[PDB]
């Protein structure tokens, strides 16, 4: 089957509510791609968004380039480069957990990513391990980690102006329950701080294996982020991340108490987790856990 | 890191209780290869058993190609051939199950690796869908079906005699536990017949999404294959198969039925498998569900 007028579908790699993912192949070049398909209903979020904050990032460092975006029959497709499995696909092959070295350097990538889209003057807002993926097995990047998936981002100031969006609350939970801001629980609008604060739960949960807040109880979907919510604000910081170097406390505590609209210390965020390499005497290397044996 | 002399290891791609997977790269002309790493220790079933069974097996369709064995370390590596993902891993893919026509499909191949398997006096004796994968993505046989894991196979007539090992009893339960056959369970021998059963709840499985035995109760490791065997023994072959083609329960039941020595007749189940495509109006086409929109 042919799409795109060059582009040639292979088989599934991956499938979400949003819709399916094939491998493919561009024909002209022979390049490998992956092609999302979203069936074209009513409630499903435009593609083209993703399209515009793919081609709004393109050059930007860990953002795959986009090739094509069009209809075909029932179905919307964005075509992508071809990348490698997820953080989240490679705990399962790592034991369910990431070693502190590991963690530091992921943070380290994954926290420049969230950066270089905050310095887009857009927040990401969904925040977990299954949309930082890394590269191609045989290639010149297959250790670096990318993020993908832009379907709810949103511009947290005008891009202009660098005037700040307005705190607002009653708001409507987006995201995966597991990694969001309390903030977010609590029904206060998205920013910076709270992109900050997903990836710092995402951090704990490489670290620990899994988060206090994980399988709850028996009740409804709303429910569900509401006693989540609550065990949030129950469990202290020093409780989460006892047994793990200071840096982690420090990050989630910064995080945590970053002011609406202030603009992070990436730098100092970042330092961080420098911190967490020396003390263990080894640098940034392509020394992941999933290269080792 | 390099193994074997002139085989570069990459990253992880699987790992099981009887070590890690890596993908590699063939130095010498460049050819993606899996690395299987075991470790030596007392209890784990030799590697070398695997290569001697893959040796046996070369140039047989649907085998990988085996191209090195020694020892490295604390660890003995066997490479293959580099293989794309399993029958289990494109279920994830396709909503938990398959369509009749992807299944009768699979089915014919399945088949024909277990009887080529047969065909040099082994018997599989760990038939289960995580260990049929499927060809690399752009490759010529991509939707070939492969088998890989021959740790437990054994024997089943002295190879040149064509004599038949003899019925014995008081065996302890290897294979996993949802798809052994019944006699299995019971701790009698296991025989062609077994690997043909085991092979017919692996169709169900693919058909329902689910076995009834799935999930039993809280209880020890030994009661677990008690009690589901007990099970699979209370499940009528109508009641399991009841919604498919005729043909699943025609397949169900020639398997349960043979006697321990007994030669099957493979051309029979294979044209049981034809028949059902017949009947939608199909050929036997490279339109595997994983392909499809
Ligand atoms: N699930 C493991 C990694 N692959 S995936 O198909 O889910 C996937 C989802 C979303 C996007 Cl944008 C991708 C881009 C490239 N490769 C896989 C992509
Ligand atoms: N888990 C999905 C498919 N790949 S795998 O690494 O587990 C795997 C396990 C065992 C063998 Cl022999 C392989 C051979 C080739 N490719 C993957 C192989």
């Not at 905050?118 to 993020?147: C, Q, T, W």
Request: hydrophobic share 35%; aromatic share 12%.
């Amino acid at each position: 089957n042919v799409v795109g007028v060059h582009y040639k579908v292979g088989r599934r790699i991956g499938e979400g509510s949003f819709g399916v993912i094939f491998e493919g192949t561009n024909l002209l070049n022979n390049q490998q791609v992956a092609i999302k398909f979203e069936p074209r209903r009513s409630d499903a979020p435009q593609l083209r968004d993703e399209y515009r904050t793919y081609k709004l990032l393109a050059g930007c460092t860990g953002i795959p380039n986009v090739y094509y975006f069009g209809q075909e029959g029932l179905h919307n497709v964005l075509v992508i480069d071809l990348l490698g499995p997820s953080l989240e696909d490679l705990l399962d092959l790592c034991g369910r957990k990431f070693s502190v070295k590991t963690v530091a350097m992921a943070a380290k990538q994954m926290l420049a990513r969230v950066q270089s889209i905050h310095e887009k003057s857009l927040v990401y807002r969904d925040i977990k391990p299954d949309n930082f993926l890394i590269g191609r097995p045989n290639s010149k990047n297959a250790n670096m980690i990318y993020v993908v998936d832009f379907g709810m981002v949103k511009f947290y100031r005008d891009p202009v102006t660098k005037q700040h969006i307005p705190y607002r609350e009653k708001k409507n939970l987006s995201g995966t329950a597991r990694y969001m801001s309390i903030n977010t629980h609590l029904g206060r609008e998205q920013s910076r701080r709270d992109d900050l604060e997903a990836l710092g739960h995402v951090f704990m949960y490489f670290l620990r294996g899994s988060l206090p807040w994980q399988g709850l109880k028996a009740a409804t979907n709303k429910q569900k982020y509401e006693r989540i919510g609550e065990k949030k604000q129950s469990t202290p910081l020093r409780e989460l991340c006892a047994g793990f170097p200071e840096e982690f406390y420090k990050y989630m505590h910064y995080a945590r108490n970053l002011a609406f609209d202030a603009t992070p210390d990436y730098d100092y965020l970042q330092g961080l987790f420098s911190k967490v390499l020396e003390r263990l005497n080894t640098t940034e290397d392509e020394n992941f856990d999933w290269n080792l044996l």
